[PDB]
Design a binder for this molecule. Structure first.
Ligand SMILES: Nc1ncnc2c1ncn2[C@@H]1O[C@H](COP(=O)(O)OP(=O)(O)O)[C@@H](O)[C@H]1O
Ligand SMILES: [Mg+2]
Length: 334
């Protein structure tokens, strides 16, 4: 494809779908990279709609496999000194958070998601090659188009963060007062995710800013300096934005979400097709990530879906959205 990769990840059935007597309507073919949905209504057992993506992950797909296939290529980009972004898009309950952060010593938990493994690899790789480096991370939430710092020890209330341009080459934004925690070792990441989780819970309870209706943006910035005898030194800065989007399924409270997700989709489609003018300025989410989506870089979207007939509507909606972002045509022979 391109620098923009769109993959789909289907989760296994959950308890509620079993108790509701739901049926599997999704078929994943990792070889042909297709996802086909049994769409028939009453008496219609023949009509199915197929879609093609850069990759397709079945329900048995393991955390490490999503990481190996989707993130490794991207992290190598970041290490070379680039800004990249990874998205988790889909219906609430389909695995966006299970995928972005997931759920010992140096060996990674098999349920660990993209975030634990990523920090993990930063330290292993930069330590192994003797690079001089420092790693800082920030975690903010976007709810009803307002920013909240999830790692600020103090200034913890329902106070939003001020966003604004900045005298410098455009595309960037400065988020006034964004807490940026320095990480000293790979394991220190779980403690960071704990603080975030605890503060998100507070915002949920004290604002109704439920995680399922918000965008979580966890950014890791790596400052690197590498040297070799008869090879000159290098100063690089890499940044990876790991985004856990709001569920794709109050009046405008659902408008801001529905709108930003549609704006995001338009920004992605504009980048794939190279149409002048990409609508970054139309949403807080795309404005904040412009600097990473703007310049040349690797960008990936992980579309999560349910396999049950109970969620057919949202699954088709998600597949259509993923298809619209990067139109890949189905190949011959079914
Ligand atoms: N692919 C998966 N494999 C195993 N469990 C998953 C998978 N995807 C989601 N889950 C499970 O579903 C729930 C997590 O869903 P979650 O990540 O919160 O979805 P979302 O973030 O989109 O709301 C947990 O029970 C989690 O273990
Ligand atoms: Mg979630």
């Amino acid at each position: 494809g391109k620098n923009i990769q769109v993959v789909v990840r289907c989760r296994p059935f959950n308890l509620a779908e079993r108790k509701a007597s739901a049926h599997s309507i999704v078929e994943c073919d990792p070889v042909r990279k297709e996802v086909s949905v049994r769409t028939g209504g009453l008496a219609d057992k023949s009509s199915r709609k197929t879609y093609t993506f850069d990759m397709v992950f079945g329900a048995s797909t393991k955390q490490i496999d999503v990481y190996r296939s989707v993130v490794c290529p991207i992290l190598d980009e970041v290490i070379m000194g680039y800004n990249c972004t990874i998205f988790a898009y889909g219906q609430t309950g389909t695995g966006k958070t299970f995928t972005m952060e997931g759920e010992y010593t140096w060996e990674e938990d098999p349920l660990a998601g993209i975030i634990p493994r990523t920090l993990h690899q930063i330290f292993e790789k930069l330590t192994d090659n003797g690079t001089e480096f420092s790693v800082k991370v920030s975690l903010l939430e976007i709810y009803n188009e307002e920013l909240f710092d999830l790692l600020n020890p103090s200034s913890d209330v329902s106070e939003r963060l001020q966003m604004f341009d900045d005298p410098r080459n455009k595309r960037g934004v400065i988020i006034k007062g964004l807490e940026e925690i320095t990480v000293h070792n790979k394991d220190e990441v779980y403690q960071i995710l704990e603080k975030g989780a605890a503060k998100r819970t507070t915002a949920a309870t004290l604002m109704n800013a439920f995680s399922s209706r918000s965008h979580s943006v966890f950014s890791v910035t790596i400052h690197m300096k590498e040297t070799t005898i008869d090879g000159e030194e290098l100063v690089k800065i890499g940044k990876l934005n790991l985004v856990d989007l709001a569920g794709s399924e109050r009046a405008r409270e659902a408008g801001n979400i529905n709108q930003s997700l549609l704006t995001l989709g338009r920004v992605i489609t504009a980048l794939v097709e190279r149409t002048p003018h990409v609508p970054y300025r139309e949403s807080k989410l795309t404005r904040i990530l412009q600097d990473s989506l703007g310049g040349r870089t690797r960008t990936s979207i992980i579309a999560t879906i349910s396999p049950a007939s109970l969620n057919l509507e949202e699954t088709l909606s998600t597949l259509e959205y993923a298809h619209r972002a990067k139109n890949i045509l189905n190949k011959p022979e079914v």
